């Protein structure tokens, strides 16, 4: 069936073979099958690595053969004569069961080997297709590849009745498990997004395969934004990973110190930091959580940070930039009047109530300057400390027992803060000694119970102050080689977004040296 | 003259006298000259303090008399009847010259006091004008204060001669040397303004007015502009000096990492910066240098800072944010070609010259760093280094010649910057050792020489690194309390506008905590 030429070939061709294929053949009377057990005799014949048995009791269709291994049944099936255009995948099909590498990508190909699913495809084609070979081809790899995708090419001039019966009208027609699947000219990449579409696959899979960043600045607030910007710049690989982009800004409706812009809000802010990194094509990761740093073991290794969704980056260099959470009073009324009166930053919200009464949460250093700070401009400040003595140094203590428009409570606990449905009004509290309840009438009320950096995550990694603050130097170098810290997060001694936005630059102008110093080779 | 309710305050009002007061008259036959005599004698009859004397001779109007001290020749004449509405002028000039205060602000007085110029008012009048006499108290006054200012005052019924001569058709009616001066009821503010004018005083001797300042900042650009919103925030009375609103930005033109901000120019940021400092009513003062600081003799006192100009400002904290000078080549062609492809700045300008050549000029670690860092984005990096060998760390330095996008020139001085007049396309140096000249076609020039930090100022007062640059801690507090700095003028890292903004935050916030607990009373 063969001539001359195609036999030449064909004896090249399977001197590339490296293991042994059967041609299992299940066989009928007709002169088809006469033509087929030919075929595959003289095919047997060019190569001691090629045998061919029959096996007509089978329950296959009637001429079809399997090219397979040895003690495995896996592999494509040609139903009717795979000569005409078909040779060629006949020819390749042989190849591929007998070792011969396949051209396609090989991440395609492991990706299809690892395909979860059961598929049994049929193709029909006709000898004189000249599109057929290539989705035979296609489908006859993925068999080879998988055991669970099975694949029988079927000769439309052989198996006439299937042709009318499931009304294959052109070619090639595949079905796969009954159903119709697709015609024409359809690639192996195409064959596998419709099988296997990677619909409600996790972010994580995905951000395994990244490659090494040249920087990966972890947290997305201002002070990761502006590292991400300045590393940018400088044309390396940088990769902005954070929870939500934006950080603290985002949550915030005025501010008024963002140092050139009198009035902006938080959240036109936060975008603008989103333009701004935008220009320069910084990988954007969001709604991820850094859940541990692993140091590099070498100078000029790689640090890597794993993930909460369980995914592995790796960076040349780490800027940590993961900010702070603001305390909360915990009690009713706080989370509806937060921007309305509730405050958490006496440097940010201070002047907008001059000459109006407010409260002060908590008496240690920052809560009893914040009420030394604030009694200067405002009407009237209470200082609210729930332990029975406050906390903060002596000398604060006594400047504020001083100032003639401040009120000291001790053993206060706030139960609510009260509004108009608009604004803050009042708060309600419990002496928590006798538990007698009492009120005050406010307009404002600045919670100052401390800040919690978002660094438990670097426990026993990077080296922490008492109060969980990253420790840096002035170039926001940590005790790690190739791992630096800016904004709100490290011991950086203010909490506010232009700080913030500086500190990121210089730890971003830090990496770069520390880059440009550990490329030694 | 005087009825006897007069006569009764009189006595009253010179009991009031510290020192003892001539009243010395010449005088003629008239009828005038005689009431005018009888007037002396019984007002000098009221008062051992008060004596008459008459003097016939004088070239003087007949009848006058002048009001004045024994041994003195100082003081107002009145020439005709001084009664009439007068009568009050003529008292308060007897208690003036008799020691009794005036009741007008003593600023105002210490003026005339010092006015320097000759000036002989004479001012017409009536008896029975009622708005006269505060005009002729005015002038009066300016007499006993300030012997080069003479008033006569001269009663119109007597000389009526001189009304109709001179043509005075209203009172009260000023001349001063011979020139009318003005009519009508002016203060005497109004006079004095007229004849001292401060047209052409300097800026100095106002600043030496100013009240102390609970915080100054010295220096107004980024930093100390930063410094200035934060601390008017707080409410304190803050001061911003500087030589030119704005410092370095202002003489550049596109910045693309003022963070959020993607493109903005130099002279717009610096406007922004204004609107930005001028919402807080800051006491921004422009063109001048500070000179000299002066700490403080003790904690809670005043820091002082003395100008070029010669004026010295008071403040119980000081913020130094007067940046650096970026030095210059000094040759042809570099001021022409400034912003045109001429840069001190890899990190602002560097992704400006992506696929172009450029050059470094300088083998310090900045400048080779500097080369290492451009040599990823460019096409080409020529580095030129003055000396025979470059500064740099050797590591640097073998980076460097590792590259292959690099060439490196040893003992190149450059000679001029050349372009095509409105670009760089080139830079010629010379071989400092054969004296060759050579060319490199180009577009842009980093300039990479040093920066020269604004404060020799302080030496002596304020602790600077070898590089001049004030050292700082984390919050920006130099060797000497209640003396903060900020920006590129300290040991900050890094030269960046958002890095200075960051700083000039921290340091207010610094300065304000030290206000705080310094007010130990
Ligand atoms: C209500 C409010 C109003 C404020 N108003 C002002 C104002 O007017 N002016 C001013 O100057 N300052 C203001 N501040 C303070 C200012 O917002 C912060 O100082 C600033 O945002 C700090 O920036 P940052 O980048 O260091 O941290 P953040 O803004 O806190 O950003 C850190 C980011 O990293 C994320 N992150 C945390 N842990 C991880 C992790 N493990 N992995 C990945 N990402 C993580 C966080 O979710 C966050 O999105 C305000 C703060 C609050 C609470
Ligand atoms: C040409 C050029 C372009 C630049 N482009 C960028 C850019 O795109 N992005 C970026 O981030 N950075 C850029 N920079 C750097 C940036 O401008 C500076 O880092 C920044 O301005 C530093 O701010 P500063 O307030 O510390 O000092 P300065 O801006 O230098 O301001 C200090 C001010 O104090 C004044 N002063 C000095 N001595 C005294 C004295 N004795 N008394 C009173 N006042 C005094 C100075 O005249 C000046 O006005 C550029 C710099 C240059 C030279």
Not at 181 to 194: D, N
Not at 363 to 383: K, M, P, Q
Not at 447 to 453: E, T
Not at 460 to 482: H, L, S
Request: net charge negative; hydrophobic share 40%; aromatic share 6%.
């Amino acid at each position: 069936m063969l001539d001359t030429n195609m036999k030449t070939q064909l004896k090249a061709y399977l001197e590339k073979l490296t293991k042994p294929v059967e041609l299992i053949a299940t066989l009928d009377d007709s002169a088809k099958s006469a033509e087929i057990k030919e075929l595959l005799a003289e095919i047997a014949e060019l190569s001691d690595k090629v045998t061919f048995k029959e096996d007509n009791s089978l329950p296959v269709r009637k001429p079809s053969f399997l090219i397979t291994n040895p003690g495995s049944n896996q592999g494509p099936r040609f139903a009717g004569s795979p000569l005409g255009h078909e040779f060629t995948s006949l020819v390749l099909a042989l190849l591929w069961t007998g070792g011969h590498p396949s051209k396609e990508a090989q991440s395609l190909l492991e990706q299809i080997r690892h395909i979860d699913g059961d598929f049994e495809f049929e193709t029909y084609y006709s000898l004189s297709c000249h599109n057929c070979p290539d989705v035979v081809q296609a489908l006859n790899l993925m068999s080879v590849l998988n055991p669970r995708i099975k694949h029988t090419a079927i000769d439309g001039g052989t198996f006439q009745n299937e042709i009318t019966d499931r009304n294959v009208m052109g070619v090639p027609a595949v079905f796969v498990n009954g159903k119709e699947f697709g015609q024409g000219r359809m690639t192996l990449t195409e064959i596998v997004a419709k099988i296997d579409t990677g619909a409600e696959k996790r972010a994580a899979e995905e951000l395994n395969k990244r490659d090494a960043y040249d920087v990966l600045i972890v947290g997305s607030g201002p002070a990761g934004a502006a590292a991400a910007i300045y590393s940018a710049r400088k044309g390396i690989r940088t990769g902005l990973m954070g929870e939500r982009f934006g950080g603290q800004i985002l949550d915030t409706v005025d501010i008024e110190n963002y140092i050139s812009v009198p009035k902006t809000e938080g959240q036109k802010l936060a975008g603008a930091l989103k333009v701004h990194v935008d220009e320069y094509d910084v990988d954007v990761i969001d709604s991820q959580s850094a859940s541990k740093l692993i140091p590099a073991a070498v100078e000029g290794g790689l640090h890597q940070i794993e993930t909460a969704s369980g995914a592995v980056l790796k960076a040349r260099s780490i800027i940590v930039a993961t900010g702070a959470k603001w305390r909360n009073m915990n009690v009713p009324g706080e989370d509806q009047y937060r921007t309305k009166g509730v405050t958490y930053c006496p440097h940010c919200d201070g002047p907008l109530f001059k000459g109006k009464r407010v409260a002060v949460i908590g008496g240690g250093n920052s809560g009893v300057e914040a009420a030394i700070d604030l009694a200067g401009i405002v009407e009237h400040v209470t200082l609210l400390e729930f332990a029975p003595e406050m906390k903060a140094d002596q000398v604060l203590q006594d400047k504020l027992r001083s100032l003639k428009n401040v009120d000291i409570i001790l053993n206060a606990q706030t139960t609510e803060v009260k509004g108009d449905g608009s604004k803050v009004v009042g708060l309600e509290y419990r002496d928590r000694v006798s538990g007698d309840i009492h009120n005050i009438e406010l307009a404002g009320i600045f919670v100052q119970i401390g800040l919690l950096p978002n660094t438990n995550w670097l426990e026993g990694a990077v080296e922490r102050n008492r109060m969980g603050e990253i420790i840096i130097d002035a170039k926001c170098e940590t005790n790690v080689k190739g791992v630096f810290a800016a904004g709100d997060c490290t011991t950086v001694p203010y909490k506010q977004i232009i700080i913030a936005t500086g500190e990121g630059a210089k730890a971003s102008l830090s990496a770069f040296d520390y880059l440009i110093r550990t490329k030694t080779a």
